[PDB]
Curated annotation (Swiss-Prot):
This is Vitamin D3 dihydroxylase. GO terms for molecular function: heme binding; iron ion binding; oxidoreductase activity, acting on paired donors, with incorporation or reduction of molecular oxygen, NAD(P)H as one donor, and incorporation of one atom of oxygen. Its cofactor is heme. It catalyses: calciol + 2 reduced [2Fe-2S]-[ferredoxin] + O2 + 2 H(+) = calcidiol + 2 oxidized [2Fe-2S]-[ferredoxin] + H2O; calcidiol + 2 reduced [2Fe-2S]-[ferredoxin] + O2 + 2 H(+) = calcitriol + 2 oxidized [2Fe-2S]-[ferredoxin] + H2O. GO terms for biological process: vitamin D3 metabolic process. The lineage of its organism: Bacteria, Bacillati, Actinomycetota, Actinomycetes, Kitasatosporales. Heme binds at H97, R101, R291, H347, C349. It comes from Streptomyces griseolus. The gene is cyp105A1.
């Protein structure tokens, strides 16, 4: 009759945009690096819930990133579209992972990201121009948080922004669908589009990273055509959805901590540190922590057995009080160094410094151009995405001094 379990259902949903779900707070407080959970289909898996243990297991080659493994810890039926072959390098292990990742790294270097700053500022202020010209109220998501990173990543990739309604919609359907059929359709829509773009570039060599992969690696048989599609799709979707969620959740969080938001406005040298703290605190991508053991792993007396699924839950690890004193306190002045919002090791987020640039430019622009920005509804009225996808809000009504 008692319902207590030692393998609670995973994932949990946030009720507050920037707070751990109650069940995650429970996992955070329970000693030990690992904890059993039950996934949507009844299967048991391990979650990693402490900070150094998370780094250790992210660096352990025995925890494979191969999503096509039958034992990979899928958290929803929609996962079967990500289990579609071929995998982009996020789903590959060394040595294949490295050969594919190095086809893309040149677009994400510190020198390239620095070169992008004028363009990102132009895009950010252009969409602010438009949203502010029309006056309040507005949905910050559709009008600003999503189009800005979309326009930026399209230029990076060589994908025509003219088609943005098409791939923004497909991107949403892929990331947010709860059934395999809906996800597979969205994936097929994007794949067919990207396959046509490849053919166009074979006719007329094109700009951007897709153009470069077509002209070089594909022409040399060094990447499969369908790998190129998967790779472009990874970057296109991650380029859209991640940054947009950080923007909306950071605005919500900062407006709920007005003393720190005011301190940030008063001293813009605090923005880089504030971005690190917001990344640590909001940790929007637990959905990207899944691994499968290819061999037994001993972890501080607990045994992960070959064939078991393991989810490195970076949001919980980022609230490890042995690393971040008073971990559930937002503190833009703390050292948020070593946070795991981008992962750790060979798969650490390729876009991390583009994301850091965009959030810095965005926060500075909002504080510059809309210092009176405020939510047009109460926080409790917003609808948070579930834990089976990237954290965030699908709409964010805002107003300001016209
Ligand atoms: C705040 C925004 C973002 C967050 C929190 C985030 C989070 C993450 C995390 C946790 C991983 C590790 C996945 C794993 O270990 O399996 C990852 C990988 C990756 N992210 Fe992001 N990401 C963000 C933005 C972006 C953007 C803008 C891009 C644009 C291309 C991007 C592209 C990638 C890629 C390509 C990988 C795979 C890297 C590899 O496997 O070597 N991410 N991201
Ligand atoms: Cl078929 C297919 C192929 C690629 C993706 C995108 O891959 C990124 C991984 N990522 C996260 C942060 N940086 C990179 C992701 C995975 C899951 C979700 Cl819910 C949201 C995102 Cl943005 C998706 Cl969604 C579906």
């Amino acid at each position: 009759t008692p319902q207590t379990t030692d393998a609670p259902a995973f994932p949990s949903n946030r009720s507050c945009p920037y707070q751990l779900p109650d069940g995650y707070a429970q996992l955070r407080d329970t000693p030990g690096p690992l904890h059993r959970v039950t996934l949507y289909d009844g299967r048991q898996a391990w979650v990693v819930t402490k900070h150094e243990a998370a780094r250790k297991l992210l660096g352990d080659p025995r925890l494979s990133s191969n999503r096509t493994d039958d034992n990979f810890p899928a958290t929803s039926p929609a996962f079967e579209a990500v289990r579609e072959s071929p995998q982009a390098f996020i789903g590959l292990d060394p040595p294949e992972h490295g050969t594919r990742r190095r086809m893309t790294i040149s677009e994400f270097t510190v020198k390239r990201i620095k070169g992008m700053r004028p363009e990102v500022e132009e895009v950010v202020h252009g969409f602010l121009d438009e949203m502010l010209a029309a006056g309040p109220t507005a949905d910050l998501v559709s009008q600003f948080a999503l189009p800005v990173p979309s326009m930026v990543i399209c230029r990076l990739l060589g994908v025509p922004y003219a088609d943005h309604e098409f791939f923004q919609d497909a991107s949403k359907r892929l990331v947010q669908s709860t059934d395999a059929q809906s996800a597979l359709t969205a994936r097929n829509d994007l794949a067919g589009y990207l396959d046509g773009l490849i053919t166009q570039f074979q006719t007329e060599p094109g700009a951007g990273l897709v153009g470069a992969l077509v002209a070089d690696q594909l022409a040399n048989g060094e990447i499969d055509r369908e790998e190129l599609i998967s790779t472009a799709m990874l970057l296109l979707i991650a380029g859209h959805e991640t940054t947009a969620s950080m923007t909306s959740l950071s605005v919500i969080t900062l407006l709920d901590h007005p003393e720190q938001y005011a301190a940030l406005r008063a001293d813009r040298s605090l923005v880089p540190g504030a971005v690190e703290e917001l990344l640590r605190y909001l940790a929007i991508a637990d959905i990207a922590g899944g691994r499968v053991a290819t061999a037994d792993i001993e972890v501080e007396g607990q045994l992960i057995r070959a064939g078991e699924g393991v989810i490195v839950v970076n949001s919980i690890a980022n609230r490890d009080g042995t690393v971040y004193e008073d971990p559930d306190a937002l503190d833009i002045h703390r050292s948020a160094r070593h946070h795991l919002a981008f992962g750790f090791g060979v798969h650490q987020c390729l876009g991390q410094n583009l994301a850091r640039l965009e959030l810095e430019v965005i926060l500075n622009a909002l504080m510059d151009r809309v210092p009176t920005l405020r939510l047009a509804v109460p926080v409790e009225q917003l609808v948070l995405r579930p834990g089976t996808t990237i954290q965030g809000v699908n709409e964010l009504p805002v107003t300001w001094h016209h």
